[PDB]
Amino acid sequence: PERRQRIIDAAIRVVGQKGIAGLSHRTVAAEADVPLGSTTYHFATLDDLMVAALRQANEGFARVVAAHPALSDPEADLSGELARVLGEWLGGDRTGVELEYELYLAALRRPALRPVAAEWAEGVGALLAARTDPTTARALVAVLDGICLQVLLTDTPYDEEYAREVLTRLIPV
Amino acid sequence: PERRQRIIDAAIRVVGQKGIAGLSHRTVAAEADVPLGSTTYHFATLDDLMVAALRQANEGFARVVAAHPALSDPEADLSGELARVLGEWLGGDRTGVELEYELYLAALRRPALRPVAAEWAEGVGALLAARTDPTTARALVAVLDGICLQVLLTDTPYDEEYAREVLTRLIPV
């Protein structure tokens, strides 16, 4: 896009290969192939750069969730919907997908990054709480996290059938 | 103990403050306050050092599990037992506890560290599969991971009552 985006994109490509540690304005400038000046002009702190990156990723996810209105439809299959939302991104692309999670975590173990790293759970959690109940909402958010790990931690494909199955055991009747 | 242990201990203290990245034979030698020679004599590669550290942590956990024979007792409360096992370490010490998880993860996003980083799930998983069934075993392992995150990702204390509650919803009848 116009260089600010180019920079955020490169920041991402750098972390997705050298980890947050190998992320500097030099690394980014090189990767985005832009003056060092540009990167600092747009992002004073590396944290500002990180935060921007996560916000982009958060919005990336908050987008697929909005593409599943059924999630808040009381007549829809909730677990089926949640398993689809997962499968929709954990499915396929086991390349850039593995990279997106391998930074969601990296982000999490960072003091000022963690709050934005789990924002996805805020939207989902708020939605499931209104749909079901607080305890069920938290339990659901918990297995979602549990399942992504299981998956993105082995040559283990997704398996919606399994996900919906365990998700369903959590929804009360 | 004798210096090999001193070194593993220091390796841990270093990662628990500078992350795997700030971990070198220099860092370790300094921290353990031992000749650089010693650290390389005992651990040729940093990966050998990391792996040793994780094995120590794995054995640390595999120890509390063995201290709960009830886990495999068909007449015992499984979810209650699992929630106790968790609460037993996630409870209190929200200092060194937070550090143990903030390296379990760090480990996980590392190609040759990940296999040893999830060994805990191998023992637990094998135990729950024999106790219940494959699908239930995996689902249980999944929420355990989910719950530790929820917890070790906010000023959020543990709450066994909650854990046992969601764990119980996963056990079939």
Ligand SMILES: CN(C)c1ccc(C(=C2C=CC(=[N+](C)C)C=C2)c2ccccc2)cc1
């Ligand atoms: C464990 N868990 C439920 C989740 C784990 C990670 C994600 C994320 C994400 C970002 C972009 C995506 N895209 C572009 C499809 C999809 C997911 C994500 C959100 C913030 C920072 C990094 C990654 C969402 C849910």
Ligand SMILES: CN(C)c1ccc(C(=C2C=CC(=[N+](C)C)C=C2)c2ccccc2)cc1
């Ligand atoms: C998400 N999950 C179920 C778990 C997450 C982490 C642990 C671990 C651990 C190490 C030492 C412990 N001690 C000394 C009590 C307790 C746990 C652990 C195992 C290997 C490497 C790092 C940490 C176990 C379960």
